[PDB]
Each structure stands twice: as structure tokens, then as C-alpha cells.
Design a protein around this ligand. Structure first.
Ligand code: HEM
Ligand SMILES: Oc1c(Cl)c(Cl)c(Cl)c(Cl)c1Cl
Length: 137
């Protein structure tokens, strides 16, 4: 289930984080307007850029902490308010988080692995709800 999936992702996190984030940026190319430094690069080129690998791993590091702290795929209000208050997320709306979790769930659904895609879908919707409640537009 969901807990085992957090372990599975953590056991190869650099690779999972990079491949899921690339799936997000390729499914939703407009979302690069938040990452202007990633424009005009192929997947292989991005995976060569120090900040791509480091930023994406840190994102997933914190996403897995938030998922691990969740009950029944519902994140702590403390984690939702951290994600809202982050200066790095100044620009963002829940739609930005929605698209990332659509890409993550589609990635899990395409993988040959027994990922609980249903639970990640719930987690993505419940994090969007918690982000709105904590004052993200
Ligand atoms: C659960 C979902 C997410 C988590 C846990 C998360 C976490 C983080 C973290 C930890 C950083 C700091 C990275 C660093 O400085 O090395 C960061 C930066 C950032 N995040 Fe997020 N993030 C999430 C979703 C999103 C989404 C959906 C967007 C935009 C569509 C976004 C846009 C950014 C931007 C623009 C930065 C700063 C520039 C960059 O890191 O490349 N985040 N995020
Ligand atoms: O560079 C980044 C990567 Cl790889 C990911 Cl996955 C995310 Cl969510 C963000 Cl915000 C940045 Cl800046």
C-alpha cells in the first residue's frame, strides 16, 4: 500500500524523483514557466544539471516526509502550512500541485510495480484541499 510505496520510492529516490518530475514537466510543458532555467533541455540534459537533480530530490525528500506523516492519505495541517509559507512557492496555486500528482499517479499506473496508485490519487487530492485550507489560491 501507501506506506510500502513511500519505502519503495525512498529506496531509489534520486531516480524516482527525477523520472516523476520529468513526467510532470513533459505532460504539462507550461509548468516550465516556474522553472525557466529548464527550458530548451531534453530529459538527459536536465539530469546533468546540478540544481535539477538536487532541487528534485529535495522536493521528493519533503513529499515523502509529508506522505509518511499523513493518516489515511490525509496530510498534517502543519505540513500543508509549511508548503504554503515556503518563499519558493510564492507564485503557486493548488492547480500546480494537482498536475504534479496527476503525473505521479499516471507514472505509478504505467510502472510494472504494485504501487497503490489509488492511495496516491487520494493523497494528491487531500494535499490540494489542505493547501487551499492553509491559504494557497
Ligand atoms: C508535495 C509537493 C511539493 C513539495 C514537497 C515541494 C517541495 C519543495 C522544496 C523542498 C523546494 C526547495 C528545493 C531547493 O531549494 O533545493 C521547492 C522549491 C520549489 N518548488 Fe516545490 N514542492 C512541491 C510542489 C511544487 C509544485 C507543484 C511546483 C510548481 C508547479 C513547485 C515549485 C517550486 C519552485 C519553483 C521551487 C524553487 C525553484 C526550484 O526549486 O527549482 N513545487 N519545493
Ligand atoms: O528542480 C525542481 C525539481 Cl527537480 C522538482 Cl521535482 C521540484 Cl517539485 C521543484 Cl519545485 C524544483 Cl525547483
Amino acid at each position: 500500500g501507501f506506506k510500502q510505496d513511500i519505502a519503495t520510492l525512498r529506496g531509489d529516490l534520486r531516480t524516482y524523483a527525477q523520472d516523476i518530475f520529468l513526467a510532470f514537466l513533459n505532460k504539462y510543458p507550461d509548468e516550465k514557466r516556474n522553472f525557466k532555467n529548464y527550458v530548451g533541455k531534453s530529459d538527459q540534459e536536465l539530469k546533468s544539471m546540478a540544481k535539477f537533480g538536487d532541487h528534485t530530490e529535495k522536493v521528493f525528500n519533503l513529499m515523502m516526509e509529508v506522505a509518511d506523516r499523513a493518516t489515511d492519505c490525509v496530510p498534517l495541517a502543519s505540513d500543508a502550512s509549511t508548503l504554503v509559507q515556503m518563499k519558493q512557492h510564492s507564485g503557486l496555486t493548488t492547480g500546480n500541485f494537482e498536475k504534479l500528482f496527476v503525473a505521479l499517479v499516471e507514472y505509478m499506473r504505467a510502472s510494472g510495480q504494485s504501487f497503490d496508485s489509488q492511495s496516491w490519487d487520494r493523497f494528491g487530492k487531500n494535499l490540494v484541499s489542505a493547501l487551499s485550507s492553509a491559504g494557497m489560491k
